[PDB]
Structure formats: C-alpha cells, structure tokens
C-alpha cells in the first residue's frame, strides 16, 4: 500500500512515518511511503502516484495558509479517485475543505494525544484497504491487480484503454481524465473472456463495450457518449464487434 | 442526470425542488429528481434499486440527529466514488462529517438566503456534469434505426425534427446542432405509440414534448424553453397539444 505525505514540519514528519510503521506490523499490512517539505519535489510525487492513492496533506506549508487546498484541488482535478485526508494544527480550516471542491475523506488536528493520533489515521489506512479489497456488495466496478500494482474504478467512467511505449504500462482514459498504469493488454483480456465489458477494435486500443453509442464506418472511428471519437477501429474488426454490440435488446 | 434526495420537511424539501428545475432550464441539463422522508424509502432506491448520480442529503430525520451521516455511510458502502452532498439547517454538524467516514462534496446550510443557495446548488450539479459520462445510465436516448441506418442521440438535445428534401431522410434541429439522419416521421410515430415522448404539430414536423415553453395561439407557432421558435402547428391539431402540455408536465 502506497502512501504519499506532504508535510514541511520534521517533527510531524517523523511523527506520522512512526505512527505508519507501528500500523504495518499490528494491522499486518505493508506500508510505503514517500514524504517532502518541498511544493515542487512533491510535485513530481502525483505524476508517479497510484490510482487510489491515499494522501497526507498539510495546509500551512512553508508560510503559506491554504496552501495545502492548492495542491488538494490540484491533485483531485487530475485523480478523480484520490484519497485526500488532512493532517494539520490550523483545525479552523475544516469548514473550507468544501469551498474548494475537494472530496476529502478526513482532517485530523495534529494537537491531539499520540495515543488518539495513532486511532484517527488508522481508520483512513483501514478504509482504503477495506474499500479496495474484493467487496461483492459492490456494484460493477472495475478491479485490476498486477504483480502488486491495484486499481478499482467504476466501469460507467471507462471510455478505453491504451498502449504505451515504456513497457508493462497502460493508460486508462476517460472524461475530464487519464491515467497511467501497471498492467498487459493480454492479462485484461483474459480475465474479461467471461465478463466481456472489454473490446479490442485495435492492436494498441482496448475499448469499454458499455459507453460505445455509435460506430464512424467512413471515418473507421468509435463513437463514445459525449462524442469521444478518438479510438480508430479496423474494417474487419468491426464484423464482430457490430453483431455483438446490436444483441443488446 | 438522476439525483436522489432525503429531506422530511416539505417547506426545504419543495425549496430545493424548485431551484433543481430553475437550474435544469437556465443550464439546459436534464435533471430528474426522487424525493422521500422516510429512511425506509430512501434505503430502498439505493441497495435493492440500480444507479443515480447526484445525493442531497438532511442529517436530523424524523427527530433522529446523526441519521443523514448512518445513511450516508450506506451510498458510499455500495459506491466508493459517489457524489455526496449535505443540506441541512445544523451548521453544527460540519466538521463532523469527516468522523463518519463519507467523503462529502459540500456541506449546504439552509439558514443563508435563496441568492446565495441557488448558487451552491448550481456549484453540485455543474461538478456531476463534468465528472459522470453522459451514458444510458445517466439519461434516455432516442436510439432509431431505419433499413440499416442509425442514430443514437439525447433526448433534451432535440428540439423538433425538420423534414428534408431527399426522400427517407429527416433533421434534427437543437439549439446550437442540427443533424440529418435516414428514417420516416410515421415511422417514428409507429415506435413512440408507447414512448409517447414526440408529437406532430404540422405534416413536415415532429415536436419534442419535453423542450416547449409556450403554444402561441396568435401566431401558431411552438415556443421552446430558449427563443427558438420555428415549428407550426395548426388550429386542426393545436387542442390536442394543449392538454397533453397540462395533463403530462404539471
């Protein structure tokens, strides 16, 4: 499990990586993180971050207030599946989280015991893991895990999925978003051989089924809800894929 | 789009209602809402029930204080990346929320005026649309085919459908678009005899029942929601229309 922590005091960056390895051995489950005081080292941090990637952000960074809801907006404008919780003394500011339209999940005062400390960020660790793990309660929602690398996002924002030329990398596309991650083309593909929520209408295009609303023959395009004419389908490929897709009924 | 909401007083809950279609025609996003007061009924439309997109939610229900968050527990139980908003007159309670777990949009207070509300409301509803792809599950689609021919389009996107020149082939007129597609008006009919969702005003047009506004008698025209008045309908034809206005849309 993958964490990412803003702080800039290194008395409470010690403070949560303690509290983040005391949990790992108790709740055992593995914790690894990565932590910085700088804006634009920890920038560089969401560019390599996880799909549902748990957040520790601070506010009042290097002394600027409300400068940890830039980097909250920020990282929810691009990850849409992010887990932002915060961790600062400026209790005050709880009541703003909503004003930036960030879906944060807790703000934890970091003046309170060790002892209550320790249980506040447990429940954040222990909703993810929860959260992110099998659930059959849980509508149709995408989960893929390779070689460690998780993911699990609704299949209703999948338009397609795409090829990349670093190797075992694939790019998840769909509105106002796309993302980077861990995974074959080939593994998705036999584990949809039953399911079939997936297509392939090209050799690097892998599209979701259930957003195709109309199909380009002249222009040999796919035509997705809101018009996402970006995926080019083969003339032979698309023999299969129309019978399959007008047996809706 | 679809959204669900909880609220057991009438005079918040018609309060929203009312700003919720205000919105729906300034905005021209379809928006169809489910209101109830029981937790029963609203538990109901979420777990043994299928998709919604947007939930407004009252946290002191039927004497019950902290009832809105159990509730709120239950959406994110079965959607993980649901879209959750709080109205409620306990201003209180905000910072609360982050002890229940749900990852709460905007916390809405009822005591601030209507200029301000209207506002916030419009801020939830523009931030559904640019998230949720506008798929079968969010709203209808008129989905036609004609000896091969397909179209697939909204519905709150057509307007009338405008008769062409070259035979088997009709146009879709919308307030910024307009889209030529192979079918016949009395084919059309002959599909939406249980639909019901378009009706024939004159021989050469085909009238949406959702997007009009007003029937001018003076000049006998129909009007929609935005000034664009263009199909006909006649004296012969105008009573009929008249009643199925009132009768379906009050």
Redesign the interface.
Known sequence: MKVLILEDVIEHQVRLERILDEISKESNIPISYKTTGKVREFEEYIENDEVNQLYFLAIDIHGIEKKGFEVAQLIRHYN??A?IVFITSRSEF??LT?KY?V?????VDKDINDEMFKKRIE??IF?TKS?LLENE???D?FDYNYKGNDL???Y??I?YIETTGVSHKLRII???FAKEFYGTMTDIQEKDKHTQRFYSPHKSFLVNI??I??IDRKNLEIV???DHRCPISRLKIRKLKDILEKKSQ
């Open positions: 849409p599946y887990i709880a009541t909503y339209q879906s944060a999940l807790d703000f429940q954040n909703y959260m309660d849980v509508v929602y699990k996002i609704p209703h924002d338009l769909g509105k106002n259930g957003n609303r109309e997705f809800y809101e």
